[PDB]
Design a protein around this ligand. Structure first.
Ligand SMILES: [Cl-]
Ligand SMILES: [Mg+2]
Ligand SMILES: [Mg+2]
Ligand SMILES: [Mg+2]
Ligand SMILES: [Mg+2]
Ligand SMILES: [Mg+2]
Lengths: 243, 195, 222, 241, 250, 204, 196, 231, 244
């Protein structure tokens, strides 16, 4: 054996064990989700409060790319920042040459090809993050989830991290109960509920909720963080459902 | 710089080179030796652009001396002249070419013959019985065409050279402050002190 | 140079004069201005002589490799694209003015290329210093639906206009006919309307006329 | 045994990394099939969307490389998309450089050459994919050309790829033994698509809904994929006969 | 990133063997048989077309390749390695010869360039050797007809006749009994077909056999007329029909 | 400061019956000043003869370069280079310096050892091959040589007659050029003997 | 050259003369200055023939690669690619290009790109040496939301006058109609347009 | 074990051992404390000597007039990272006439450390940093780990026995956060914090290092007799 | 990374030997023997071809003896492909010297440069050394006739008579026995063939398993001629000395 000691090496199965090992780093991370809605997308993430000394609201994890795309990830946080930095470079060069802001599927492949490139050589390490991202373009709303292998798909709802299975089950119920569609403001509330429900798998430390959204009607197609009254309203909705 | 002459006789090559270094309206020096010994039996005189001349001469000198030490052997005058020509032929298509004209006087010990090569800054090499660079040739060539014989002695060559310097001192516009004369033969290179 | 190209029924024909000049002096009285890029793609070239030859050989070489790579007969548009991009890259400094013609699986084609890299399409074209004399003939006698023999006549007539009226052009007419479904036929010295008349006198000298100083045998063996 | 980790020869003259890349090909558990008509080239592939949270419209292994060339992949999607982007870039550059559309077989050779390099150069791994290129070439007509991680490529009368490829292959062989010709003797592409689905059904022994399949069709001057309703229309036609 | 493999992957073992070259030759041994025979007025190179599937069109896969109008190549071993070597070989005939001298290289020199390319894959950083042996047949004005074998090491040898690959040992012995210095091209084609039948198991016809010759100039294959000095390629691939004609009088 | 007319010189080649002749002057000057009367402009590599006019440093450099290249040719090819092949090599080598050329007017002359055919060719400073049945001219008296050759020349001259024609072509052309002359050399070339003759000419 | 592009109710029409010159010699009297960079995105070329061809070829390549990845590009996107090439290489280019395309969302659109490489979106654009002579006429006669027949007549009359006064312009009047219906090529000969 | 040869290798449970070993170098380092109010931010550092003949290794470095940090672990790595911060602060001033936000300073350090954890040949930085600053959004304290993780805090501590000070500050949170407009009291709280990490040794005059930045105070460091006030 | 697969071709053993050089020499010891003998009026080069097949084209073949210029030749023992890389370099180097100095390159200068290239592959670059040992036979007007040998280490030495490849130990003893200084070329020809005949691993030494060459001043007056023997000429010289 020894097939798992070097990135880009195929095992006799046809697997890249180093990528599968990067997936273990993602499964260890905190829960993050994405909900696709009527005219946009909603992102939420669990922020474990390690200590009283953490300044609330001041360790922001959701990131904006361009002005219309939001990104959230679970696993090695620095790795996720590296991916977003590249995403921002990709989006800038697309807008530079083609004028129009980068479409979400186009942006999804840019990240995909870049992450896939880090499975091609033994001189680089795969990314230790699964990234949920999306936004609104000329063809409406798109939600994506990208994994260490470079694999990504479009999603109705997406979840990753330590509470992914709990969150997935909760996401599937929304898809079944709302075939016509979920509204942006509703999806924000649901995101809060699901993060709280997914927190059961990480319940030693209590947490801080962070939500963002892009909606054609609610945010004018731009990425915005959910703060103040709308955030507290979403927190309260979630608190009522766990009891 | 300015005047460099060369005469190949029966048994030796004689080089005469002007002593003046003039810049602007001032003769800065009247004892300048415009020559470098490349090997025991090879001497090179030079004239041309200020700075370029000595820089090129010493660069060639270093290379021939390096060769001598590496092989424990002295290159033939023909071999040295070909090396020098190629360096100038490279130089002429560089960003800044060496503007240096040279005469190479050598005694081939394997052939027991004196040899004189005239090479200009373009890398134009010719073997000659007598040579000159610059305006000097316009007086000396015709003079030597008349008085030179291929079987002359070193003493006869020196008298023939005196005749050239006298003509140049009569008809040339500039004061070149006389010449340093050096002889290259079977015994190597020596300088005539009273000219 | 005068060079032309003329399309017909089932293909295309190109022609050229054979004069090469250096200022007012005729350097070559019978030079070949028709170049083979591939078996059925040929080029007529005016401008700087070494440039038209070199650019035609390079693209011809690359076209051969491309043909071998793709297992396909080369197309005129490929030679056209490769030539124009090469010439554009050199901003006119490679003084090649070319009429590119030939037949390929797509059909028969006729193009011209300027030294700066612009290209034309047409049924009849002329380039070079004698192109105005040639074009005058082409504009006077060209018509749609020419036969093979009509197109050759028109093409060579257009070259003749250059030969007689342009001091840059002279000597002979070369022709190449590229017909669909057939081998290209290169007609070297198709017309030779400038044969030198008999000289009035033989200038053969009595042996010993030239004074000689030395003689020697030259060794060419090893 | 480091000769099994990089693309150098084993004592028996084998390249294990290339062999293991072939096994990665079946990791998706999807079977693909390609056939030729008179005027067209049809490629079909299974579409398995296990997760209910996936947007099914974004799950695809068929790619439009150029206006004329289509490509279906057997293997993981990251490597599949890597190959697709390169193929698109290569086909675009070819058109710019040489003034005509890149033929299906030439693109196949080029991609096969790139794959060969990964089998010889150590720092680059092979892609765990098999690429089937389809078109209606303006010179050669309906064309199927297929590439693998060894850098091998060849033209096909018809072909199949995936875990249950052998069943489909022999099924197709037996049809062409019977018909005595190199293609599907049919006028419309619609019926060639129907043939393709029919013979996949027989070979695999499974029934397909409109969302269990994926269809690409190449005609003169365009390659296009079918919608769920285009396939449904096609499934209805098979059932009513 | 970047190729960090700047070191040799082929190195000397204590016994003196170059492992990767030996193993490359082993890959050639597993490869399908190919052969070459030199006649007085031509050269024949032949091989079996091992079809991967009966659905595959074996015409689209050419094992015998034209390098120059007067030079052809065939191989035993790894097909993909051969294909890229043909691409490189065709190009080097232009870049390092035709673009300099205005004519195609003589066989020995083109062979020498291919051998160099294969030698470099044996010493350069981060590459394995090519897993093929080549047989290159060709003609040139001053050397006449010739036949060369190029091995993974980069070594090349001139041959009167030889075989490489699967059943090369038996095929070489067969060729030793039949070869003389008076063989005419048609006699060499006949012996080539006989020798190949021994190593071929299944179907033996013009669709499963690939065969090309280096012989007389072919003006009909030139594609143009008008230049007397250009007389056409000496390389010609025999058609499926032309092979079957000779298999009846076998 | 026109590189092709600083040193001066001429070369001419002619074909005869089963023979070729190539001739050159001996002058090397620096504009008005004559410097050397021993500067030969014709060289040979095996049986292939090359004459070069123009800037003398490039004449020397190209001789050394073609000796270099023909020596390696012979080692690899195991045969002497032929005039047709050498002509192509000269053209390639010159065009390689397309935008920084050698200021030369080379002339190839020789007999193909396989076919027995006499061959001559000329080039411009950048590689354009000028092939001829009759004669090639080069140098600062090229106009004069063109006039002399075009009138004096007739086809299929015998080696001894061809010598007289080419010599009279060079001599009278050189005497109408300030930068050409100061001696002359003529090469008469047959299939397997070459004769070199120095001509007596006026020394002004 | 005299070139123009005009938006109307159903889309946009491009127009051009067919004259290419070197000094006062007409090197080509049947030139096609209306160039396809995509199915329904075309351009009118003016300035250096070599420069505008080289640019159009690069743009067509870029949009082909765009389409392979992201589907049909917008007319604005095509104009941006033209701009990028013209702006960044302004020292080495003599190209005046009018870009015109048809979207189904945006309908007809015209972008003009002068020498410097600036972009200007307009209802209609005129360019080339002959445009100078029809600024007055075109400003007085252009109306928004014209019909196909009205727009054809507007371009025909405009280029007729541009051709009449500009020596650099002449030959035939070519036009390309870009609508939802497809792509239509029109040609008009001297005997028609000269006597307008 | 088999997966700790370099940073480019993941372990089977998804760990990066070289990064974890770099983290270990910080744990061996001398204790340093960081804390802030709404008006000021304070660093306190315990300096370490080789012996009684040697100087005490300086722990605190100034980055700009409004920013600076304290270090624990490999000191040369802190010099490299502080120099990078000095340049980034400087770039912001020269190009934008803008003082670099302490938050951006954190993002920049994160991304610089990260690149050393994904490529072959490199190694992770072997030092932890506590960055304090005062910018347009008031006082700040950041904790840098060479894994790339940067965290904004009211207070913290890194180094050997840092858990004592970290627990203390966690208890004292409500008190010290409201020490506004009083530098000497915020320092006293930090000096009391670092005292919870001492064993057998006590704070002397050439042992203690204090830094402060705030509303009307440039980043300034106190050593020697200037810290005698606080013992 | 890639460190895992690095053989480290340019390192020392604990004993201070270069592994790869030693193993390359071990490879060369299985190659066909080549012998050089320097006489007062010329040099002989003799080499044994590696086990021949009867269908090998013998006349148009070159494996052991290569021409570097008109005055210098080499006998090869080792990988032929490796040798041709080095031979082409040596050929170019000779022409560079001739172009620079207008004189044919002195033998030692050419030998030193080729040996320096070999040395480089043992000290830097991480590549395997060239598995080749040369015997250099040449003439120049300084030292006259010279024999040299170089091996994968890049070390070269001068010889009166020397062998490389297989059975050098036995071959050297035999050469040491019958060689004397006043020897002539034709005597040296005989010694070379006799030595190969006794050291060969074959049953009997025949013309088809040999390459032969002489470098004499046996041209016409004060000039040197290289004679690469044709098959028939080797057949004759083998009969003339009574080996067959
Ligand atoms: Cl390729
Ligand atoms: Mg590899
Ligand atoms: Mg004169
Ligand atoms: Mg005079
Ligand atoms: Mg320009
Ligand atoms: Mg007009």
């Amino acid at each position: 054996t020894g097939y798992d000691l070097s990135n880009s090496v195929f095992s006799p199965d046809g697997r890249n064990f180093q990528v599968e090992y990067a997936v273990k780093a993602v499964e260890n991370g905190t829960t993050s989700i994405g909900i696709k809605c009527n005219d946009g997308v909603v992102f939420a993430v669990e922020k474990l409060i390690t200590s009283k000394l953490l300044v609330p609201q001041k360790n922001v994890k959701i990131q904006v790319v361009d002005r219309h795309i939001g990104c959230v990830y679970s696993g090695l946080i620095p790795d996720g920042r590296h991916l977003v930095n590249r995403g921002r470079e990709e989006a800038a060069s697309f807008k530079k040459l083609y004028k129009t802001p980068i479409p979400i599927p186009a942006f999804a492949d840019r990240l995909g090809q870049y992450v896939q490139a880090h499975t091609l050589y033994n001189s680089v390490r795969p990314f230790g993050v699964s990234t949920i991202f999306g936004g609104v373009d000329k063809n409406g709303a798109h939600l994506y989830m990208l994994e260490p292998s470079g694999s990504y798909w479009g999603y109705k709802g997406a979840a990753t991290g330590k509470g992914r299975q709990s969150a997935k089950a909760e996401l599937e119920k929304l898809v079944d109960h709302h075939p016509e569609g979920l509204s942006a403001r509703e999806a924000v509330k649901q995101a809060a509920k699901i993060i709280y429900l997914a927190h059961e798998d990480n319940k030693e430390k209590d947490f801080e909720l962070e939500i963002s959204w892009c909606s054609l009607s609610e945010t004018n197609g731009l990425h915005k963080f959910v703060k103040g009254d709308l955030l507290q309203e979403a927190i309260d909705f979630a608190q009522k459902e766990i009891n | 710089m300015d005047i460099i002459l060369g005469i190949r006789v029966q048994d030796s090559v004689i080089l005469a080179s002007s002593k003046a270094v003039t810049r602007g309206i001032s003769v800065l020096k009247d004892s300048d030796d415009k020559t470098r010994q490349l090997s025991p039996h090879t001497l090179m005189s030079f004239a041309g652009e200020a700075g370029d001349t000595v820089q090129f001469a010493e660069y060639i000198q270093a290379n021939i001396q390096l060769y001598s030490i590496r092989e424990d052997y002295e290159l033939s005058p023909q071999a040295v002249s070909s090396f020098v020509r190629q360096e100038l032929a490279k130089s002429i298509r560089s960003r800044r070419p060496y503007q240096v004209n040279v005469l190479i006087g050598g005694y081939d010990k394997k052939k027991n013959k004196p040899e004189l090569y005239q090479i200009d800054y373009l890398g134009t090499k010719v073997e000659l019985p007598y040579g000159a660079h610059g305006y000097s040739g316009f007086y000396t060539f015709s003079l030597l065409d008349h008085h030179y014989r291929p079987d002359m002695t070193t003493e006869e060559g020196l008298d023939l050279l005196k005749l050239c310097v006298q003509e140049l001192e009569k008809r040339m516009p500039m004061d070149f402050k006389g010449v340093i004369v050096k002889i290259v033969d079977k015994d190597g290179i020596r300088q005539v002190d009273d000219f | 140079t005068t060079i032309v190209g003329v399309k017909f029924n089932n293909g295309v024909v190109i022609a050229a004069d054979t004069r090469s000049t250096q200022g007012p002096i005729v350097a070559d009285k019978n030079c070949a201005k028709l170049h083979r890029i591939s078996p059925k793609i040929w080029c007529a070239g005016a401008g700087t002589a070494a440039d038209t030859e070199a650019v035609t050989q390079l693209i011809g070489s690359n076209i051969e490799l491309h043909s071998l790579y793709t297992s396909r007969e080369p197309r005129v548009v490929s030679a056209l694209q490769m030539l124009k991009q090469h010439l554009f890259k050199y901003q006119g400094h490679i003084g090649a003015y070319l009429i590119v013609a030939g037949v390929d699986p797509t059909g028969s084609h006729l193009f011209s290329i300027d030294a700066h890299g612009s290209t034309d399409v047409g049924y009849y074209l002329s380039l070079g210093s004698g192109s105005l004399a040639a074009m005058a003939v082409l504009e006077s006698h060209w018509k749609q639906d020419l036969t093979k023999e009509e197109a050759i006549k028109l093409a060579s007539d257009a070259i003749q206009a250059g030969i007689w009226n342009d001091l840059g052009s002279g000597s002979n007419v070369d022709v190449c006919v590229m017909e669909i479904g057939k081998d290209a036929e290169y007609l070297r010295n198709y017309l030779t309307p400038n044969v030198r008349e008999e000289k009035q006198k033989s200038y053969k000298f009595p042996r010993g006329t030239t004074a000689v100083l030395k003689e020697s045998i030259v060794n060419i063996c090893d | 045994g480091y000769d099994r980790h990089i693309t150098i020869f084993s004592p028996e003259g084998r390249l294990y990394q290339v062999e293991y890349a072939f096994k990665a090909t079946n990791q998706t558990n999807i079977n693909s099939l390609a056939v030729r008509g008179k005027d067209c080239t049809v490629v079909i592939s299974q579409k398995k969307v296990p997760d209910k949270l996936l947007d099914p419209t974004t799950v695809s292994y068929i790619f439009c490389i150029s206006r004329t060339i289509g490509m279906v992949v057997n293997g993981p999607i990251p490597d599949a998309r890597n190959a697709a982007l390169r193929a698109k870039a290569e086909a675009a550059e070819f058109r710019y450089k040489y003034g005509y559309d890149m033929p299906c077989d030439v693109l196949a050779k080029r991609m096969a050459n790139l794959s060969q390099i990964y089998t010889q150069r150590a720092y680059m791994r092979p892609l765990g994919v098999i690429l089937t290129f389809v078109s209606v070439d303006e010179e050669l007509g309906p064309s199927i050309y297929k590439t693998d991680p060894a850098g091998y490529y060849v033209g096909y009368k018809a072909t199949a790829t995936g875990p249950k490829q052998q069943e489909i292959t022999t099924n197709l062989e037996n049809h062409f033994k019977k018909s005595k010709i190199d293609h599907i003797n049919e006028e419309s592409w619609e019926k060639v698509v129907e043939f393709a689905i029919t013979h996949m059904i027989d070979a695999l022994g499974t029934e397909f809904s409109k969302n269990d399949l994926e269809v690409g069709v190449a005609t003169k001057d365009k390659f296009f994929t079918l919608s769920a309703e285009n396939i449904e229309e096609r499934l209805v036609a098979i059932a009513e006969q | 990133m970047t190729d960090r493999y700047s070191f040799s992957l082929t190195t000397f073992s204590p016994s003196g063997k170059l492992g990767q070259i030996d193993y490359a030759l082993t890959a050639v041994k597993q490869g399908v048989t190919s052969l070459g025979i030199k006649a007085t007025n031509g050269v024949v190179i032949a091989t079996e077309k091992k079809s991967s599937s009966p659905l595959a069109m074996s015409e689209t896969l050419s094992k015998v390749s034209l390098l120059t109008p007067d030079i052809g190549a065939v191989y035993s071993g790894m097909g993909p390695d051969y294909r890229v070597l043909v691409d490189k070989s065709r190009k080097v005939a232009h870049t390092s010869y035709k673009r300099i001298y205005g004519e195609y290289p003589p066989t020995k020199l083109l062979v020498s360039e291919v051998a160099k390319i294969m030698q470099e894959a044996t010493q350069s950083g981060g590459v394995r050797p090519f897993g093929v042996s080549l047989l290159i047949a060709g003609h040139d004005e001053f050397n006449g007809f010739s036949l060369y074998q190029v091995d993974p090491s980069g070594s090349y040898f001139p041959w009167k006749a030889t075989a490489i690959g699967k059943g090369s040992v038996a095929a070489k012995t067969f060729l030793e009994k039949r070869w003389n210095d008076e063989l005419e091209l048609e006699d060499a084609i006949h012996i080539a077909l006989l020798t190949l039948k021994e190593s071929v198991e299944g179907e033996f016809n013009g669709d499963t056999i690939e065969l090309a010759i280096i012989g007389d100039e072919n003006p009909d294959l030139l594609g143009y007329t008008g230049i007397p000095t250009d007389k056409g390629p000496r390389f010609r691939k025999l058609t499926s029909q032309e092979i079957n004609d000779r298999l009846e009088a076998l | 400061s026109d590189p092709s007319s600083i040193n001066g010189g001429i070369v001419v080649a002619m074909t005869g019956k089963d023979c070729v002749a190539i001739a050159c002057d001996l002058r090397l000057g620096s504009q008005s000043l004559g410097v050397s009367n021993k500067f030969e402009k014709i060289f040979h590599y095996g049986h292939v003869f090359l004459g070069i006019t123009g800037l003398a440093t490039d004449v020397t450099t190209l001789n050394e370069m073609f000796r270099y290249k023909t020596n390696l040719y012979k080692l690899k090819e195991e045969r002497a280079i032929e005039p047709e092949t050498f002509t192509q090599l000269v053209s390639s080598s010159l065009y390689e310096r397309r935008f920084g050329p050698y200021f030369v007017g080379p002339v190839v002359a020789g007999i193909n050892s396989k076919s027995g055919k006499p061959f001559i060719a000329g080039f411009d400073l950048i590689g354009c091959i000028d092939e001829a049945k009759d004669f090639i001219v080069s140098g600062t008296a090229s106009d004069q040589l063109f006039g002399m050759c075009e009138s004096l020349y007739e086809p299929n001259l015998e080696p001894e007659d061809l010598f007289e024609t080419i010599s009279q072509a060079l001599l009278n052309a050189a005497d109408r050029d300030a930068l050409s002359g100061w001696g002359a050399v003529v090469y008469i070339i047959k299939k397997d003997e070459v004769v070199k003759r120095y001509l007596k000419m006026r020394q002004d | 050259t005299s070139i123009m592009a005009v938006t109307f109710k159903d889309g946009v029409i491009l127009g051009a003369d067919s004259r290419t010159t070197t000094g006062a010699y007409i090197a080509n009297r049947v030139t096609d200055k209306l160039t396809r960079v995509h199915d329904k995105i075309w351009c009118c070329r003016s300035g250096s023939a070599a420069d505008t061809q080289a640019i159009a070829d690069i743009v067509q390549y870029h949009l082909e690669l765009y389409t392979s990845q992201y589907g049909t590009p917008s007319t604005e996107t095509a104009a941006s690619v033209f701009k990028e090439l013209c702006y960044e290489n302004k020292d080495n280019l003599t190209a005046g290009i009018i870009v015109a395309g048809y979207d189904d969302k945006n309908k007809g659109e015209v972008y003009t790109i002068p020498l410097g490489g600036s972009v200007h979106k307009l209802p209609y654009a005129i360019a080339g040496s002959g445009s100078t002579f029809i600024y007055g006429y075109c400003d007085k006669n252009f109306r928004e939301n014209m019909s196909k027949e009205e727009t054809v007549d507007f371009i025909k009359h405009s280029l007729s006058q541009a051709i009449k006064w500009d020596g650099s312009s002449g030959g035939v009047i070519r036009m390309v109609v870009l609508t939802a219906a497809g792509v239509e090529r029109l040609i008009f000969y001297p005997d028609e347009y000269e006597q307008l | 074990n088999n997966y700790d040869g370099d940073t480019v290798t993941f372990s089977p449970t998804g760990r990066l051992f070289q990064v974890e070993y770099a983290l270990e170098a910080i744990k061996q380092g001398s204790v340093t404390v960081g804390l802030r109010s709404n008006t000021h931010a304070v660093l306190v550092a315990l300096k370490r000597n080789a012996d009684e003949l040697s100087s005490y290794q300086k722990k605190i470095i100034k980055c700009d007039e409004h920013m600076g940090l304290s270090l624990a672990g490999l000191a040369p790595d802190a010099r490299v990272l502080s120099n990078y911060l000095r340049q980034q602060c400087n770039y912001s001033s020269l190009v934008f006439n803008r003082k670099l936000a302490v938050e951006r300073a954190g993002h920049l350090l994160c991304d610089k450390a990260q690149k050393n954890t994904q490529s072959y040949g490199g190694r992770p930085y072997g030092v932890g940093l506590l960055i304090i600053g005062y910018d347009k959004s008031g006082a700040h304290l950041l904790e840098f780990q060479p894994s790339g993780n940067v965290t904004e805090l009211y207070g913290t501590a890194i180094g050997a026995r840092s858990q004592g000070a970290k627990t203390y500050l966690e208890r004292t949170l409500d008190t010290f956060i409201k020490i506004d407009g009083n530098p000497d009291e915020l320092i006293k709280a930090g000096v009391e914090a670092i005292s919870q990490s001492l064993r057998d040794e006590s704070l002397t005059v050439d042992n203690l290092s204090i830094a402060i930045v705030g509303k009307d105070t440039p980043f300034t460091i106190y050593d020697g007799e200037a810290v005698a006030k606080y013992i | 990374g890639s460190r895992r697969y690095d053989s480290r071709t340019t390192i020392f053993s604990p004993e201070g030997r270069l592994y790869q050089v030693e193993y390359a020499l071990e490879s060369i010891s299985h190659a066909g023997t080549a012998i050089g003998i320097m006489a007062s009026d010329g040099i002989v080069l003799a080499a044994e071809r590696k086990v021949t097949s009867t269908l090998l084209e013998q006349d148009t073949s070159t494996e052991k003896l290569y021409k570097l210029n008109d005055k210098i030749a080499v006998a090869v023992a080792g990988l032929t492909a490796d040798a041709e890389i080095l031979i082409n370099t040596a050929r170019i180097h000779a022409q560079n010297y001739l172009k620079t100095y207008n004189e044919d390159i002195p033998v030692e200068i050419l030998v030193r440069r080729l040996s320096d290239i070999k040395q480089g592959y043992t000290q830097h670059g991480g590549l395997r050394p060239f598995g080749v040992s040369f015997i250099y036979a040449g003439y120049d007007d300084r030292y006259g006739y010279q024999l040299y040998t170089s091996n994968p280490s890049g070390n070269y030495t001068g010889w009166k008579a020397i062998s490389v490849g297989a059975n050098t130990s036995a071959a050297q003893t035999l050469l040491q026995m019958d060689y004397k200084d006043d020897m002539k070329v034709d005597d040296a020809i005989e010694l070379a063939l006799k030595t190969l005949s006794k050291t060969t691993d074959s049953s009997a030494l025949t013309y088809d398993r040999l390459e032969f060459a002489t470098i004499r001043k046996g041209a016409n007056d004060g000039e040197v001629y290289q004679k690469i023997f044709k098959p028939q000429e080797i057949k004759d010289i083998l009969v003339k000395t009574g080996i067959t």
